[PDB]
Structure formats: C-alpha cells, structure tokens
Amino acid sequence: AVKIGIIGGTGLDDPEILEGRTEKYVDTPFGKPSDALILGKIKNVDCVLLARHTIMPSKVNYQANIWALKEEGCTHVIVTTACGSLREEIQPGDIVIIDQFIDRTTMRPQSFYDGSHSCARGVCHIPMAEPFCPKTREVLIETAKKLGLRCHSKGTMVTIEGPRFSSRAESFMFRTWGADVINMTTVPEVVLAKEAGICYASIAMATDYDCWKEHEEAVSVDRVLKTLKENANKAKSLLLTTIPQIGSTEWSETLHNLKNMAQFSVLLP
Amino acid sequence: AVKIGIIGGTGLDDPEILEGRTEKYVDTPFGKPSDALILGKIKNVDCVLLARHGTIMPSKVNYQANIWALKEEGCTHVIVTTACGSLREEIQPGDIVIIDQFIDRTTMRPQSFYDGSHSCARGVCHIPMAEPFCPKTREVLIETAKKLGLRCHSKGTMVTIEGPRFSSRAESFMFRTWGADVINMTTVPEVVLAKEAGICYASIAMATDYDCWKEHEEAVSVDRVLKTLKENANKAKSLLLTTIPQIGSTEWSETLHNLKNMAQFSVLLP
Amino acid sequence: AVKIGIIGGTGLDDPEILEGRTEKYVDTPFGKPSDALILGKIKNVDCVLLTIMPSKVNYQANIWALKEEGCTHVIVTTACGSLREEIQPGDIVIIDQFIDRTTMRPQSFYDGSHSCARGVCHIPMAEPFCPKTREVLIETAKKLGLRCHSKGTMVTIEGPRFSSRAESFMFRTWGADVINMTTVPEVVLAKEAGICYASIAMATDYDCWKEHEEAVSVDRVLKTLKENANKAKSLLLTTIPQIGSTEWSETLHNLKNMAQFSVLLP
Ligand SMILES: Nc1ncnc2c(CN3C[C@H](CSCCCc4cn(Cc5ccccc5)nn4)[C@@H](O)C3)c[nH]c12
Ligand SMILES: Nc1ncnc2c(CN3C[C@H](CSCCCc4cn(Cc5ccccc5)nn4)[C@@H](O)C3)c[nH]c12
Ligand SMILES: Nc1ncnc2c(CN3C[C@H](CSCCCc4cn(Cc5ccccc5)nn4)[C@@H](O)C3)c[nH]c12
Ligand SMILES: [Cl-]
Ligand SMILES: [Cl-]
Ligand SMILES: [Cl-]
Ligand SMILES: [Cl-]
Numbered sequence: 001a002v003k004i005g006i007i008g009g010t011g012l013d014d015p016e017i018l019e020g021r022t023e024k025y026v027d028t029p030f031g032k033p034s035d036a037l038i039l040g041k042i043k044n045v046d047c048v049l050l051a052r053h054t055i056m057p058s059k060v061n062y063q064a065n066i067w068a069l070k071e072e073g074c075t076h077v078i079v080t081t082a083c084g085s086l087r088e089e090i091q092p093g094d095i096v097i098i099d100q101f102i103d104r105t106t107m108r109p110q111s112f113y114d115g116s117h118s119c120a121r122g123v124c125h126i127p128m129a130e131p132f133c134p135k136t137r138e139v140l141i142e143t144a145k146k147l148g149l150r151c152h153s154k155g156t157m158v159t160i161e162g163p164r165f166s167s168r169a170e171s172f173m174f175r176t177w178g179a180d181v182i183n184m185t186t187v188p189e190v191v192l193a194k195e196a197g198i199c200y201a202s203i204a205m206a207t208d209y210d211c212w213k214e215h216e217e218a219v220s221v222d223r224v225l226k227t228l229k230e231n232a233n234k235a236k237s238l239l240l241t242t243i244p245q246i247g248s249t250e251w252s253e254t255l256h257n258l259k260n261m262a263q264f265s266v267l268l269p
Numbered sequence: 270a271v272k273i274g275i276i277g278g279t280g281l282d283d284p285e286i287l288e289g290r291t292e293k294y295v296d297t298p299f300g301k302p303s304d305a306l307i308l309g310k311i312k313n314v315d316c317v318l319l320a321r322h323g324t325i326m327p328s329k330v331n332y333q334a335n336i337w338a339l340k341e342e343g344c345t346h347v348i349v350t351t352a353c354g355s356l357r358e359e360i361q362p363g364d365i366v367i368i369d370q371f372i373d374r375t376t377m378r379p380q381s382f383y384d385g386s387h388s389c390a391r392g393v394c395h396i397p398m399a400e401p402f403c404p405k406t407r408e409v410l411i412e413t414a415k416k417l418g419l420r421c422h423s424k425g426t427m428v429t430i431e432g433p434r435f436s437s438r439a440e441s442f443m444f445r446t447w448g449a450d451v452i453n454m455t456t457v458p459e460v461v462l463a464k465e466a467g468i469c470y471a472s473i474a475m476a477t478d479y480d481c482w483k484e485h486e487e488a489v490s491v492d493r494v495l496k497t498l499k500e501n502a503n504k505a506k507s508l509l510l511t512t513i514p515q516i517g518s519t520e521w522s523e524t525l526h527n528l529k530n531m532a533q534f535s536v537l538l539p
Numbered sequence: 540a541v542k543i544g545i546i547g548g549t550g551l552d553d554p555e556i557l558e559g560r561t562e563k564y565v566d567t568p569f570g571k572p573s574d575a576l577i578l579g580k581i582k583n584v585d586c587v588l589l590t591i592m593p594s595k596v597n598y599q600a601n602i603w604a605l606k607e608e609g610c611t612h613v614i615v616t617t618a619c620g621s622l623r624e625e626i627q628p629g630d631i632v633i634i635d636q637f638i639d640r641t642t643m644r645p646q647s648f649y650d651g652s653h654s655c656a657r658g659v660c661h662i663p664m665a666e667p668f669c670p671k672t673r674e675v676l677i678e679t680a681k682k683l684g685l686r687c688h689s690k691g692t693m694v695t696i697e698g699p700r701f702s703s704r705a706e707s708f709m710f711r712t713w714g715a716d717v718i719n720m721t722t723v724p725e726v727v728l729a730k731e732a733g734i735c736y737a738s739i740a741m742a743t744d745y746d747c748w749k750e751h752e753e754a755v756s757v758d759r760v761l762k763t764l765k766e767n768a769n770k771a772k773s774l775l776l777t778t779i780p781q782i783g784s785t786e787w788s789e790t791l792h793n794l795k796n797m798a799q800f801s802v803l804l805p
Pocket of ligand 1: 008010057081082083085160162165166182183184205207208209211219221225228232395537
C-alpha cells in the first residue's frame with residue numbers, strides 16, 4: 001500500500017486534484033510540524049500534503065515533519081524545491097532530479113536518535129552513499145521526458161544554512177566542489193527520511209544563476225518569485241503525472257531494503 | 270545626514286580625535302551590545318564607536334545586538350577594522366586589504382535579524398550577498414590609502430573561521446585552493462547583518478601573519494599577531510581618520526536608497 | 540613523570556595488562572566525562588583509560604579530567620573511513636593534520652563561563668599532533684610489521700550520518716585521506732591543556748567514493764574492527780613503554796608555553 005508524502009508541492013491542495021480532503025494537526029516527540037497534514041487521494045493514490053514553511057529554512061521543524069509523515073504510514077516522500085543553478089547548462093525553469101547533496105548547514109539536527117527521545121533510542125549512523133530513491137528518480141526522469149519538460153537526470157545540491165544568499169566567492173567555490181544547484185532545505189530532510197526508511201526524491205527547479213555568472217542578474221527573492229511564477233506549473237504537472245506511476249510500481253523489495261538499512265544503522269548498548 | 274559606526278577601530282576614543290564624547294549603554298531586542306556606544310564627532314562627522322570584544326571569543330560576540338544598536342543610533346555607514354592572517358605571499362604582514370568578498374566557515378552564528386521571534390523584524394529575509402561590501406566606501410578607502418602611501422590591496426576574499434582556535438595547516442592549504450586571500454574570525458556575520466539593516470559596510474583588514482601555510486616560516490600565534498599590530502596598527506588608524514571626512518563629504522542618497530530597497534524587497538511576508 | 544591518557548584504546552582494561560587498577564568517577568567544571576577513569580600501570584608507565592552520538596560526547600569534560608589527573612600525553616585510537624585507494628581497511632594511519640567539518644561542538648575551555656579558564660584562548664593548530672609521539676608510533680608499527688601510513692589528514696564530520704558520495708568526492712579534492720567523527724575537538728582541547736596528543740587511526744571501510752564497491756555501513760565497520768582491532772591494541776601496548784623512557788621536558792615545556800601564551804586577558 002503506497003502512501004506519498006508531498007512537501008512544498010505547489011497547490012496540489014485543490015478540490016479538482018485532491019479527493020477526500022481531510023485536514024489534521026499532529027504532535028510529535030520533536031514538536032509541531034510546519035503545518036497541518038492534508039490527507040486525500042490524487043489519481044487514486046493515498047497522499048499526505050505538508051507545507052514546509054514565513055519561517056527561515058534554519059527553523060523549519062524537519063524532524064517533526066518527517067516523523068509525522070512516517071507516523072501517517074508514508075512509504076514515499078516527494079519534495080519540490082526552488083534552487084539556484086551553478087552550471088550554464090542548468091537554465092532557470094529547468095528541473096533537476098537531484099541524486100546527491102553537499103551539506104553546508106550548521107544549525108540543524110540531522111537525526112531522530114539524539115539520546116533524548118526514547119521512541120528513537122540508541123545512535124544511528126545512516127548511510128548516505130545514495131541519498132535519493134533510485135526508482136522514484138527513474139519514474140520522475142521518464143515522466144519528465146514524456147511531458148516534454150526541460151529536465152536534468154542528475155545533479156548535486158549544495159544546501160546552505162541561509163537565510164542569506166551566497167557570496168560570489170562562495171558561489172565559485174561551490175562550483176569547484178562539484179555542486180550543480182543550490183538551496184536551503186534538502187538537508188536534513190533527505191537524511192531524516194532515510195533514517196525513517198522512507199523512499200525520498202526531490203524535484204528541484206532552477207530559478208536563477210546564483211551570482212557566479214558575470215553576464216546575468218544576480219539572485220534575489222524577486223528574481224526567484226518571478227521565475228517560479230513563469231515556470232512552477234511544470235513541477236506541478238511532473239508531480240501529478242508521476243504520482244499514479246508510483247502507485248502502480250512494485251515497491252516491497254525497495255522498501256524492505258530501506259527498512260533493513262535503517263534498522264541495522266542503529267547501535268544499542 | 271551621514272553617521273559612521275566604527276567597530277574595532279583602534280584608539281579613536283581619544284579627546285584629541287573625538288569631540289563631544291558621550292558614552293552610552295543601550296539594549297536591543299537581541300540583547301546587550303559588546304560594549305557601550307561612544308558618540309561624538311571626528312573631523313566634523315558624527316561617529317559611533319563600538320568595541321567588538323568589549324574579553325569575549327568571536328563566537329560569542331552579540332553581532333545582532335551590535336549592528337541593531339548602530340542602526341538604531343542612525344548609522345548610515347559602518348567601517349570595521351580587523352586583523353587577519355595572509356594566505357598569499359604578496360599580502361605581507363602590515364599590509365592593508367580592502368576586502369570585497371567572504372567565504373563563511375562559521376557554524377554557531379545567527380546571521381539574520383528576521384528569526385521569527387522578534388516582531389521589529391517580522392518575516393523571512395533572504396539578503397543578496399553577491400557584493401557584500403559597499404563599493405563606494407571601499408573606493409574611498411582605496412583612494413585614501415594610496416594618498417597616505419600605504420601598502421594596500423584593493424580587493425580580497427576573507428575566509429571567516431569559527432575559532433577561537435587557529436586553523437590547521439591542512440585547513441590553511443584548503444582555503445588557498447578555495448580562493449581565500451586572508452583569514453579572520455569576525456567578518457561573518459557582521460557584514461551580513463549590516464546589509465540586512467541597509468547600512469553601507471566596509472572593512473579594513475590588516476594582515477598580521479601568514480597563518481601556517483608556509484612550512485618555512487613562523488606560524489601564527491597570539492604573540493605574533495600582537496607584535497605585528499604594535500609595529501603597524503597606526504596605519505589602520507590613519508586610514509580610518511583620513512577616510513572619515515571623505516565619507517562625510519561624498520553624496521550617498523542613491524547608494525543608501527538602493528541598499529534600503531534591496532533590504533526591504535528581500536523580506537517575505539505571509 | 541609521564542602519565543598517558545588513553546581514549547578509545549580497545550580493551551586495555553585487562554588485569555593481565557593493567558596493574559594497580561583503580562576505577563574512578565570524576566566531575567569537572569564542564570560536566571561528567573563519558574565514562575569512569577581507569578587508573579593503573581601498563582608496563583611500568585602510569586596510564587589513565589577513558590550509546591552517545593559523536594556530536595554529544597563531552598570532549599571538554601574528558602580532556603579536562605585527564606589533565607586534572609596529571610596526564611602529560613594522550614593517545615587516542617579511532618576507526619575511520621579511507622578516502623585513498625592505498626589506505627586499505629585494516630591499515631593504521633598515524634594522522635598529522637585535520638580538516639574540521641563539525642558544526643555543533645565547543646572547541647575551547649575558555650568560553651567566558653568557567654573561571655578555571657578565564658580569558659580567550661587562540662590555540663595554534665599548525666601542528667596539531669605531537670611529532671615525537673607520532674615518530675615513536677611510526678617506528679613501533681614498523682617493528683611490529685604493521686601496515687601503517689606515516690601521515691594523513693583526517694576530515695572530522697559532524698555525524699551521526701555518514702557522508703554522501705558528493706561529500707566523499709569533495710573531501711578527496713580537499714586533501715583529506717581519512718574520515719571520522721571524533722578527532723575535532725579532542726585534538727584542539729588537548730593542545731589547549733598543554734597535553735602531547737597523538738592518534739592511531741584504523742581504516743574500516745572506503746566510505747562511499749567508489750561507485751563500484753560496497754559503501755560504508757555500521758556492519759561493514761564492525762566487521763573490519765572484528766578482523767583487525769588487535770593491531771591497534773598491539774601498537775599501543777608496545778608504544779607505551781617507549782613513551783615512558785623518552786625524554787619529554789623540552790617538548791612539554793614548549794607545549795605549556797604555547798598554551799599559556801595563547802590566552803588573552805583584559
Ligand atoms: N541562489 C540560491 N541560493 C540558495 N537558495 C536558492 C533558492 C531556494 N530557496 C528559495 C527561497 C527564497 S524565495 C521564496 C520561495 C518560494 C518557494 C516555493 N517553493 C515550492 C515550489 C518549488 C518549485 C516549484 C513550485 C513551488 N519553493 N520556494 C529560499 O528559502 C531559498 C533559489 N535560488 C537560490
Ligand atoms: N591566522 C589567523 N587566523 C584567524 N584569525 C586571525 C587573526 C585575527 N584575529 C586576531 C585575534 C587574536 S589576537 C588579538 C588581537 C587584538 C586585536 C586588536 N584589534 C583592533 C585592530 C585591528 C587591526 C588594526 C588595528 C587595530 N583587532 N584585534 C583573533 O580574534 C583573530 C589574525 N591572524 C589570524
Ligand atoms: N566512513 C566513515 N565516515 C565517518 N566516520 C567513520 C568511522 C568512525 N566511526 C565509526 C562509527 C560507526 S560504526 C560503530 C563502530 C564501533 C566502534 C568500536 N570502536 C573501537 C576501536 C576503534 C579503533 C580501533 C580498534 C577499536 N570504534 N568504533 C561512527 O561513530 C564513526 C568509520 N568509518 C567512517
Ligand atoms: Cl530551499
Ligand atoms: Cl577577527
Ligand atoms: Cl565547510
Ligand atoms: Cl569517529
């Protein structure tokens with residue numbers, strides 16, 4: 001029984017899209033989620049909507065958000081994020097189905113197993129070699145091709161602490177590190193999802209070229225918002241078309257392996 | 270009406286320099302500043318002096334309170350003076366660097382006023398940092414340093430480390446490969462918070478050592494830094510003293526208007 | 540009078556190895572250490588032996604306790620991932636540098652809230668690991684026939700998660716040779732306390748930078764330690780008496796001066 005958590009996914013909270021709408025405020029051992037969970041079906045697949053933020057990315061309760069989705073029975077989480085492009089070839093409006101990250105966050109709890117919550121006792125060392133679910137990514141990539149969307153099949157997201165944008169020296173340095181796109185929210189979301197044994201993937205939409213590029217207008221909030229206004233529908237279409245493909249793919253082996261990975265990453269006395 | 274905040278600026282708190290001296294302890298929504306604000310005029314320009322460390326590790330300095338206080342006092346400009354390590358042979362101890370970029374290696378530091386818990390700063394702020402330091406102020410600093418005959422570098426990238434420890438040699442080498450030219454512990458988040466407050470911020474960095482990336486020279490220590498400052502700190506003081514009246518007689522309204530707009534339109538509201 | 544703090548050093552707490560065994564629970568201005576201190580002699584040398592994510596270990600209390608007990612030296616043993624083909628699982632690396640990728644960790648005793656440590660301390664880190672101790676480790680490893688690398692840069696990550704593959708590749712480009720979660724701030728605090736610090740790092744995996752091999756997991760690390768941990772124990776046991784009969788007064792005097800003159804006061 002697949003159930004898809006959706007974070008930041010535009011306006012899928014729509015009666016034309018979401019059937020059986022049920023709003024729900026939950027509490028977790030880690031505090032309150034960002035918003036109420038919105039339950040319902042989209043193309044006959046059970047979904048759980050959760051708005052990520054009004055709140056700086058540093059302060060979003062990622063632990064509570066992922067814990068809530070897990071407690072609701074989510075097997076998958078698909079997030080949508082804006083991002084800056086650090087590569088000429090990734091143009092504003094392009095989608096990037098990211099497959100790696102580089103952590104530049106500093107203030108963020110990255111584990112449920114922190115020694116202070118005995119629903120998560122012990123110490124967890126989760127592998128991150130492949131942080132994003134390969135099968136989900138393959139469906140996203142294939143669906144984007146069918147929809148005719150400008151889409152990159154891989155890429156490394158650098159997540160900065162924020163809320164400030166990067167300096168130019170930082171932007172150039174991230175390029176030398178191998179980062180392709182830049183944002184403020186992928187970490188620790190992706191990490192906590194893996195700890196919970198959830199298949200996690202991300203739809204990243206480039207909105208700007210950060211500030212590395214000597215021939216273009218540097219990033220600002222208005223530049224980001226403008227590009228999203230002109231392009232956000234692409235991400236919504238990809239997500240809507242992808243959901244039923246996920247609903248009719250087989251997952252029991254994938255989910256079993258994720259469960260084992262999560263389980264055997266925990267050390268106990 | 271220009272008013273210049275001055276942070277770490279040697280001994281400008283001197284009756285021969287500062288006229289109308291008024292000491293002042295303030296409180297902010299972010300807690301107490303590092304020290305009392307010293308108000309007065311230096312060469313006919315309103316100035317506000319603020320010691321950065323009062324005895325306090327760079328990690329613990331209340332940067333938010335410091336910048337908020339200067340903003341609340343009407344400061345349009347902030348000029349900071351900092352010691353730094355050189356990561357380049359050409360930047361010798363005693364040289365001044367008018368930095369134009371930074372690389373953040375800090376970890377513990379709030380970098381925004383708009384943190385969701387202070388309703389003098391409601392919403393979320395994503396301040397642009399493509400050009401973190403005020404270009405016009407930097408141009409005045411550069412031109413003034415040339416006139417004073419000072420060894421001065423017109424640009425450079427400051428890496429700011431968390432501290433209070435110095436860097437390892439592997440860290441020092443890595444920072445060179447990243448494009449950093451000098452290294453310190455205080456530029457971030459000061460520069461960031463000043464931009465959020467719409468203040469024209471510039472920095473005078475004085476190289477005091479070569480960090481530890483030369484295996485064939487004396488590595489940095491507190492005594493090496495103090496020795497170089499003893500032999501050279503007057504250069505930074507002279508630059509700052511000569512610069513203040515040039516800032517006082519430059520036109521700023523367009524520069525300040527653009528900073529204000531940038532700050533204002535970086536804020537997202539519900 | 541040398542006294543050697545030993546951290547993570549396998550099972551040296553053995554009556555066949557450790558003589559005047561005295562268990563001891565201490566408190567410090569920084570809170571409780573990770574475990575009780577086990578005092579005793581190993582060969583003829585006074586030693587102090589010393590569930591929680593690496594982020595939460597009370598490194599300040601641990602190092603303060605060892606200092607307060609009179610330790611002149613600290614030798615730590617650590618597992619680590621290898622970021623270089625030539626450093627194979629089971630190899631020992633006598634590390635000589637680090638790169639800090641931690642974020643949550645106090646790295647100083649002189650934090651403005653403890654007046655056993657008043658002022659601000661800016662400790663030099665050009666040479667974070669004691670050269671003489673490292674030379675003894677290297678020479679002893681050669682005598683024991685152990686696979687050993689005479690230098691290496693440890694990147695210490697915050698954890699508790701392992702690194703992503705993009706992170707692993709990036710660390711290679713930065714010059715890191717091995718990767719762990721505990722060297723920083725341990726090495727830093729030891730230098731502040733004027734203690735001669737060295738590290739025995741044992742590679743347990745290749746992290747995840749090979750796209751054609753099994754990535755690191757807890758079970759891969761545990762398996763390699765089961766097959767190899769005795770090497771680190773042997774190195775440490777054989778090294779202790781060499782440290783006990785080396786002269787240290789100049790080395791310790793210079794460390795003491797460095798620590799002392801790194802402190803700024805009002
Ligand atoms: N150069 C850059 N460096 C670092 N990060 C970025 C970003 C991404 N966000 C954006 C945000 C500031 S603007 C307000 C965000 C509105 C928004 C809405 N959604 C969900 C979404 C995503 C894609 C398509 C449709 C909806 N994601 N973001 C800020 O939190 C950072 C873009 N460019 C960057
Ligand atoms: N290699 C290096 N790595 C990282 N940082 C540095 C520094 C800069 N400071 C120095 C400080 C510890 S020593 C005490 C300095 C006292 C002082 C006094 N002033 C004011 C001043 C500054 C410049 C010129 C004139 C006066 N600024 N600092 C410590 O806070 C860091 C220099 N080299 C570095
Ligand atoms: N790729 C990698 N990236 C980052 N760190 C590592 C490590 C080091 N440890 C390992 C630990 C997770 S597994 C739990 C192992 C339990 C243990 C037991 N001992 C004692 C020991 C150590 C060295 C030599 C002999 C015994 N040390 N660790 C985790 O706490 C970090 C190894 N590979 C890494
Ligand atoms: Cl983001
Ligand atoms: Cl500094
Ligand atoms: Cl970093
Ligand atoms: Cl470790």
